[PDB]
Known about the structure:
The complex is a heterododecamer, with two copies of chain A, two copies of chain C, two copies of chain E, two copies of chain G, two copies of chain I and two copies of chain K.
Chain E: E1 2-3, E2 5-6, E3 15-16, H1 23-34, E4 41-45, E5 48-49, E6 67-71
Parallel strand pairs in E: 2-6
Antiparallel strand pairs in E: 1-3, 4-5, 4-6
Chain G: H1 11-22, H2 30-44, E1 49-50, H3 52-79, H4 87-97
Chain I: H1 9-13, H2 19-28, E1 34-35, H3 38-64, H4 72-81, H5 85-89
Helix pairs in contact in I: 2-3, 3-4
The structure holds a DNA duplex.
Amino acid sequence: LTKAADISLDNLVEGKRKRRS
Amino acid sequence: LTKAADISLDNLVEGKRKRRS
Amino acid sequence: RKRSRKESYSVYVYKVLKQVHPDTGISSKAMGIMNSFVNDIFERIAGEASRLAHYNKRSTITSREIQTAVRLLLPGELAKHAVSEGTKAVTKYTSSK
Amino acid sequence: GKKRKRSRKESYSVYVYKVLKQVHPDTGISSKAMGIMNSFVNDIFERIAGEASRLAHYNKRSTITSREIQTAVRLLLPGELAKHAVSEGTKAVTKYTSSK
Amino acid sequence: MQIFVKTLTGKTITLEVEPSDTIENVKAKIQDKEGIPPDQQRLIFAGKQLEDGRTLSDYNIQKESTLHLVLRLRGG
Amino acid sequence: MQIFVKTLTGKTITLEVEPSDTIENVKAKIQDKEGIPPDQQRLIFAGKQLEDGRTLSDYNIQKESTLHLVLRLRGG
Amino acid sequence: VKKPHRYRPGTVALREIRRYQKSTELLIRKLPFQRLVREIAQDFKTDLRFQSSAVMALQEASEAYLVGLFEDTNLCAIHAKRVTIMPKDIQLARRIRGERA
Amino acid sequence: KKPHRYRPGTVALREIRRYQKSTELLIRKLPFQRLVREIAQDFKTDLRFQSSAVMALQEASEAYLVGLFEDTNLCAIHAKRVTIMPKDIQLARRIRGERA
Amino acid sequence: KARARAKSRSSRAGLQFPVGRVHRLLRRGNYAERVGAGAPVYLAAVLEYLTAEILELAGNAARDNKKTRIIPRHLQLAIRNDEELNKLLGKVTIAQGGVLPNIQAVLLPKKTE
Amino acid sequence: KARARAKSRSSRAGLQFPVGRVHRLLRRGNYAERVGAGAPVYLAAVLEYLTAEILELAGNAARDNKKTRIIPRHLQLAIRNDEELNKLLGKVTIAQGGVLPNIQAVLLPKKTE
Amino acid sequence: RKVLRDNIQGITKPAIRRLARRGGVKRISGLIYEETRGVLKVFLENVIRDAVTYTEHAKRKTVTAMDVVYALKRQGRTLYGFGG
Amino acid sequence: RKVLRDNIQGITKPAIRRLARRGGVKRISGLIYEETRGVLKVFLENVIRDAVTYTEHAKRKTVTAMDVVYALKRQGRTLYGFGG
DNA sequence: ATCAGAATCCCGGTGCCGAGGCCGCTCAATTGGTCGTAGACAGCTCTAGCACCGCTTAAACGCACGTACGCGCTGTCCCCCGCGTTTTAACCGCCAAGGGGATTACTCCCTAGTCTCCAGGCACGTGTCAGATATATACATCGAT
DNA sequence: ATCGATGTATATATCTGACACGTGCCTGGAGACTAGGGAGTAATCCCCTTGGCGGTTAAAACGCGGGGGACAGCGCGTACGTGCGTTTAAGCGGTGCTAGAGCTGTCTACGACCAATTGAGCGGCCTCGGCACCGGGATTCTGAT
């Protein structure tokens, strides 16, 4: 559910993004 | 010898371009 | 409420047609091709003319710009004629009133 | 003294270099390696703008605001990476929003 | 009535509150427990800016309705 | 002295002239042989605009130096 | 039955290839192609709307896309001298174009 | 007899490890330059080069051909022929579409 | 006081495209701070050259199928024949396009004694 | 008068990139008639996110070869490992790049020899 | 009467064949029909997203032709005739 | 000395092999060396033109790095590190 | 496997030049401030998108059969790889000279901005002929006998 | 080789709706004017490029010899093309409903633009250490046996 530049800044999971390699 | 937008507009051979097919 | 005129090149297209082909007609869809067809080339051109400005740090797009971009953007001999027609045009417009 | 002086050639290097210590306090970088990053920015950077641009026409907006960029972000970046990018930018905006 | 707030860290702060409690009261309580003065604080509800004089039920803020925490930095 | 002019058609016009001959004279001769009045005429030398009072040797125009023909259209 | 005349195997296609290259019409039967979208549409957002024109675009592109896919793909098994395609060819060909990697 | 000869193909597989391991440019510098100036001359006579700028081609050029071989490699592999053949390039390029 | 008449830069180039309208586009096209007066003219004709250059191919190809009204297929069939133009539009696809009739040799049929 | 302190929008976002300078770029970037005040900020951070996201990969990879100073090869070796980023830059090549060590199985040695 | 029957299987074994004919393919293996439908969706996937993405950026509930267009162009597939 | 000569043959049979190694090519046919040099030039051809074309548009007699750059980008090859 | 035997890796010493750091100047950013307009937002209408149905049938599905192609095997012949030695020109370091690109100050041509003026270009309406559709017939060729 | 039926090719007549045209209404371009800053030009600078020269030193070359990979021939096994009867749902046009796009109308917030003050960021600077260089000893395979 994309928005208007809300405050939904939801997740500090980026480490899992870095895990993708 | 390319130029500055000269008056060298040299050839009306385009028919040969059309001949390429 | 209803108008605002949606501008095309259609008429402009249609004029050209009779000069090359006095006989032939065209379907709107076929027409729709051309109208879009213009902008795509057209935008391709401008953006390159733009890039020239920075790389020369010119603030202004003049003729000399466009031509340079033309030789870039168009392939092969077609460019030269394009160069030619535009040139031949400029001169003819140059002496105008 | 200072002849004919080389007009300052701007980079992101320092900016790059700052970030480095936050993620890697230890590591250094070679100019060539640095040279990568500095170029690396603009490429992404120009990709972004041009898309933000295209939005304007297609909405006939005359102005690129934030809402624009984000839209382009989701276009341009692949996969989950976008969302975080969305996130950081968003988190930034708010934090800058209340500023002054 | 219990609600939460989510942070830049995603910290979820436990809040025992009432729908008539002022933002003035709330931030103070966060100032109270978390020691962070409101001067650098604001809380978010659905992106809207919170004024002290407003209460929770003013925004139709319900129990366990979680909010977006902000550090507003003046200086630096 | 013989020179030529090249056209939009690439027509190459034979010209018996003299380096002191005026553009006034030249176009008239083209008006003379080709019937096209100077009003709609101009000739080009290396992209420069030709004034009547100028002569050929004014531009260092040599024999068999070929020129670019123009129809200047006023009206339409 | 007294001997049906059966076109030699492969002869049908070579008529179709002439045929289906000769005319312009869209090979995918329309309506199901639409339904295919609305599903995929739903996942990104619920409750979305389409100018029936706009759907046609995909169809135009989609068929066109797969068309261009086959040519190189065709060349692949031909480059293996196997007059029949094989699925790896797509996997090969796409890998070549770089849509994957 | 005596002399130890690496079985055929063993050399390359060391080189492939090797030449993928390091970064340096495989084309001899100076001749590569001369190659340009010729091609340069045809479009305009009497042209000048920042020796840096030449390096770019070299960087790109090698890089380009590198990416060429991979699919190319796959080609004859897709034909199960461990050796490349010129048609493969002709095949591969016509696939990428630089030709048609 | 007297305009008395009127003249169009397009006519002033004796060319069919609306120099004026194009020249309007660039002004708002965000393509530069300023627009050279000469440029659009030069820019205009180029298209007016191409538009013919393509249609001519179509028309001839349109006559080939002996239908007096140009269709898309022709345009498609036209474009892919010119060895130059194909490289212009190769990244581009055409509505109702189809492709050129083409067959790989080894796939051709055989008696071929 | 007496503006009396100073503050930088970058600091105002607590972010390392020069919001001001970027915000200058778009103004002349011919990218739109006007520039939203908010936009560049948002635009800035994104890069400031990426620049880290890449370097982090490099640094770890830089430590792998046990050289405290990042080199291009690492960046190259870094980028091609992330399965996302590769699709960002796939069209792009890197100076001094090289490629990942890679070998096709059937080309591997043995036959058990 | 329920929801969600088949869809992607709605691209039929004969249908794709027609394309393959236009593709200039003389004989077709059976498993092709599987992987084919795999790619097709995968293609349509990222394509639709963007036009959708534009669409929401337009705050409009409907996908238009122009939407699909701008999807293809930043994709690299740029198309004509439904644009404008 | 006379006039300029071999050139393109100055890309040597061993040299290209090195690339092929980086290309991950186990064994190489002989005729490769021909067609290889064919493509290489053809690539360099259009590439150089543009940077040249920019260069004359700059009214400057010298090709710079930035020139080669802008050649690749409107080509689609965009590169880093020699760009300023 | 089990052997020596290469070639490659990892290691401790040394060494040099580009990193990464500070010195200080300057020019791009920031501040405070005015002005107007792009676009937000609420109101309103009017297109076309969705929905739903049934008469019609062209297309799709499913199975039967065998043909001719995928591929697995073999077998030959030569085109590349390995390796030792013989031949070229790549490279590095060093200085020398002037082309051209970089920077600066000046004037004037050219383009943005602004207003008033009107037909080029658009939508709108309309009437007819190019082309699509249906149906009979002749021409070509493939495959069966 | 001759023979038949199949699909394509083509000829007709036939019916329909889309292009192409004429009419009239308006918006975007033309016209004429100003004021301002871009760019062009000329005048000086110095940096970067080219050039030419000679020393070792690796890399290119070239050949030799034989191994294994390419390629061609063959044969087996089977999958995929073809056809037919059965089955399913696409396409048609026809009717009904309102959601949402697009057009509209007012007020004002946010951006551009100007000026004056301030340090962030760049080039220029030197010293210093991460790392390129290597000669010796540690390992990890390759081919021969």
